[PDB]
Symmetry: C5
Subunit: 312 residues, 5 copies
């Protein structure tokens, strides 16, 4: 009911540990994900010391009330966690073991500049606030940190779940606070992205490029404009997978380049027809023959430059 007084001036150390159980509902647009895990705490309080021989037992059990419990809170959460106590055990020396299961929704920013091949690090921050009588710090128990083998995120590969052992101590509202950081590393599964997104767009663009082997104005106009319409329709079809961010990504740059290429192809067709009308067929033939080689080479070079820029 009251914090344990220090011996002379020493602070109170609380050892923490989080065991991951389930993770779900990773929202890329809202930058949120849900968690469900165990929380373990351990501190020392000599007011609970007892003689095992006299009592006849080795470990005693206590109610969540009638016992002082440090106030641990999460920083980057939408609401307070929904938790229920599992076990509270005390040792003859006075060491208290605390265990509980909780659920929470976490806010963590994401960076999707390299959307198909990005890696992210989700953060969970644990903080404690000191009281007027005693100062409290936080520590990491490396044997209580882990994850279940059934943890899965759709479309992601879970790599590791560690914690930074060194806490961060700072003052807030004229009170000392200590903060710990838990990190979960994930990587995106980029397969099925090629045959579902990349290849059909390239097929439509290559179909549009066939206008360089024809001299009929009507057929070329139909081909190019209808392929533009088909490209827009495919973009509408696949927009649900593309990231929706206020900054430019790799795929968005590729799509913008495709739009620019469509515009340039329209210009080339118009120029060829106008030159043909003016009774100068040699210039038009030279221009279309040059374009036949120029377009794919420029496309490849621009793609290589963009890939080096984004991943270099």
């Amino acid at each position: 009911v009251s914090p344990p007084p220090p011996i002379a001036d020493e602070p109170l150390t609380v050892n923490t540990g989080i065991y991951l159980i389930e993770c779900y509902s990773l929202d890329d647009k809202a930058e949120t994900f849900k968690v469900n895990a165990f929380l373990s705490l351990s501190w020392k309080d000599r007011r609970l010391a007892f003689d095992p021989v006299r009592s006849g037992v080795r470990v005693k059990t206590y109610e969540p009330e009638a016992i002082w419990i440090p106030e641990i809170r999460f920083v980057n959460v939408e609401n307070a966690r929904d938790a229920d106590v599992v076990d509270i055990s005390v040792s003859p020396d006075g060491t208290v073991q605390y265990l509980e299961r909780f659920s929470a929704r976490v806010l963590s920013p994401l960076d999707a500049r390299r959307y198909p091949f990005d890696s992210q690090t989700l953060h969970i921050y644990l903080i404690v606030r000191s009281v007027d009588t005693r100062n409290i710090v936080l520590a990491v128990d490396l044997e209580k940190v882990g994850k279940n083998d059934d943890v899965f995120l759709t479309g992601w590969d879970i790599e590791s779940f560690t914690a930074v052992v060194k806490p961060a101590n700072f003052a807030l509202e004229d009170r000392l606070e200590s903060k710990l950081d838990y990190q979960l590393r994930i990587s995106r599964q980029y397969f099925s992205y090629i045959p579902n997104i990349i290849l059909p767009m390239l097929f439509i663009l290559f179909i549009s490029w066939t206008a360089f082997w024809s001299t009929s104005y009507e057929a070329n106009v139909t081909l190019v404009v209808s392929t533009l319409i088909a490209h827009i329709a495919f973009n509408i079809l696949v927009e649900t997978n593309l990231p929706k961010t206020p900054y430019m990504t790799y795929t968005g740059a590729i799509i913008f380049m495709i739009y620019l290429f469509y515009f340039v192809a329209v210009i080339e067709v118009t120029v060829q027809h106008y030159l043909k009308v003016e009774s100068q067929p040699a210039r038009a033939a030279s221009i279309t023959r040059a374009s036949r080689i120029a377009f794919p080479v420029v496309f490849l070079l621009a793609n290589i430059i963009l890939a080096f820029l984004f991943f270099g």
Copy 2:
């Protein structure tokens, strides 16, 4: 209020049983489903023994409090179950019967590689944690496991609801735990998928294939490109039924093959026109006559190979 002490060293056995009442909200993308069922527990505690003759009654009733109840928890759930106690009865020998009704949301992965003709097995995991004084194990009561005849899932056929009798015992956080597995088998109803998805796409492709009986460049270009646009529009229309997974499925492979066939048809039309312009009509006629037979046969062979690959 305290676990029942053992006679000498024997563990405490709890017999479990789940009677399914309702199932709803099966989300394929989120891999979740909701449940509503009865939970039955039965253990032995000799501290509650009584004489039926002296008491004048055969079965006694107790409040949920003032009685020790084992702590049973679900593993693959988003939040803790919402449950309410129904009946607690004790026998003169000391056997306690526990019954309750609960609702929960379960997380279970799904495999939709053969989307139209897939079968799934949903899992519900039941776990218990031992205490410092006594060790607790779990058992299955085969007469308390079943489902109501009104249980239904839209678009699925419910086949069976059984449980694995052998529990899994392991250590976690220096404590013994026992786990049971309940399995529900379902199969998808694949009718109305043909006339709503498969046939219109084949009709559009067959319409596109009519360009092999004509020698007009403008008409062929219009036919092929407009059929491509129609195919993309139909894909947009029916995307709500197709599975959205990070891996390739049967229908996705079929759709990709259709895209490739459209591209090849465009190439064939362009080649025929270019050969005709060069004053070589015999080669163009031979090529289009060959394509007339080549396209459907190759389509059929590729479909057969794909079907053998996915279902073999």
Copy 3:
């Protein structure tokens, strides 16, 4: 606090009644709807008998606690009902009157084979579980069953709200249970469906049919394929009203027939052009003249047959 003991062996009868207040959120895809109504119960318990002359009052009032209340539960509900007690009154003879207001979400399957002109019957099931001391049955009070005149469902006409007087008694988990069924009959308002769905589709099909009065291959190809694209676009526009079921309905069959007709029209145009190219104009003229009559008559006959099949 305890069930009322019987005189010798008679069971306890509970008279029930539901007065509908509001209904809302009818989901066709999820087969759910929300309700808000009054629940009325009435049984007999002689332990509460009193003398009106001695007490000076005719009707006494009791708290929800300190009084035995039968446990009534709904079967086809997602969660337990959210209810609050309104009045508890006792008669000198010992008859107890119970009233409460509750809200719940009900699961009831729907059949939409005749989507525009279907009628449905929503079911609410009420059950009670017997105790070890006394057996309880259910009865219907016909004067406590009704609905408010302000009850409305968007797009539906409410016809009646009755209850089956005969309960169903069966054993479950070695315990007797009694079940009552409440039925609400509704019919769909099919107006505004014609001018918003049926007529534009027929207009597009009739526009496509104009190709039988022309001999230009390019114009016919453009007409038919562009009308196919327009049909797909209109289907995308109006898909939000069409039912999404795993079985075939009337409108879906009509749409599939329209797709088949488009395919056949494409085939006819191709055949006419090919015959014209082969320098056989008489056969092509005969074929197109025959098609001019054949197409609408076959459409009408097929529609009549389909209507007889679905509504016969």
Copy 4:
């Protein structure tokens, strides 16, 4: 804890008042809106009379419990209101003043026949149920009814918030009930509807009408069918603003008329081409010259008639 007994037979009068604070989430399809306001009640109970001189105070304060409070409920609400008591004050004469803040979701039907220029009246119904000892009626306190100046609804203009002073008394379940009606009048802001919905559709139709100045069958077919496709696409684009009701509205009638006009234009183009093929150019020229004037005049006349029908 008990209702105040009457002097001889008079009923108990409760004066009510609602002060609007916020309104939000007006759903046209679901016919629902959310509210947040103050509730004020005032009745007379002589059991609380006290002498201000002896007590030394003028106004006393009471807890929500240990005091009889009339049970006020809302009729057209999805669930029970979420309310918290603010102040309870009593006068030496015995008059009690009650104040609370609540939030609720209201169900109120809407009529959108004249969608762009419609006005609605939202209703909130307040009811009370009499007890066996005393009968209770409701009254309106005109000085406690009002709204905050910051109340706003997106796309609507708030006009007034009054209440019908006369209550409605009727019997339900053999008990007397009194009902009050609170009305909120709103009107829709119809600007930005013209340049975002009306004008582009008219532009597309006028573009389609240019086919009457040309004699080329291919160009006319392309123009009309492509404009039909564009009209359907624009309808898909703007469907999110159009009302979704089971009855016909003004805008829906306009759209249906536009569809009919497209069909008639197709028929005219076909007739002109067929007459031209039959070597009768004078008839075709006369028909197209007549159509040039006939189409816009008929469109204007039909629009005027429709406007008079809907708003007359």
Copy 5:
């Protein structure tokens, strides 16, 4: 449990302060956003005075109950805040320090007339209600107002978070109330808007403008109408980013201007063809040569005028 009586007539002053922690879920259409912050209160109550020497402690701690706490409420919130007390400390002089953490959903109107380059000011209103015994006012503690460095809003730049020091006092329901205003200033990140929205639309319009260099009626009709279809499709693709408001914005005006330009281009093409048919080629050549210059210059001038109108 009772408000502190004044010395003679002075009011009670409460010093407030809000420290922002997290902000998320900014809905432009619903004009709502979620918050999570600390609330700090400080007042004076001499009934809690104590001697530090006699007590042996400097700061005492109290439970949230058994102590009078002023009732602070938010005005523009959907529901009551979800808060939990953190610390309650008292000074020997009697000054009480109050701290709590809360979460809430705020309603604040937004103005998006200059959608790409708009700035907004979100408001949070704090109010208190006086009691019959004592009058309470509000004050701002400038050292308790701030925000965390990790506060982020997707697509926005956070600039400042201040408060108006002067409260607003007014009477409501015959009671005095004091209101404080907290303001958060944000600005929108307008990058990636150009290459994702503006440039493709201009490319499509420029493609449509190429019809002024050709004299073929069929090609011009195809170009213009197909570009109109592509523009509508792109609008459908990008509608998710455009604001949905009942008033006109900058981007909406630009889009309407583009529609008008498409209509005028159609008219020009029709006029040119009709003049050519009438055997007057010089007039048609002059008109198209004039249009070649007229269209882009008028577009630029109109854009400049619109930009000056909206941002001037």
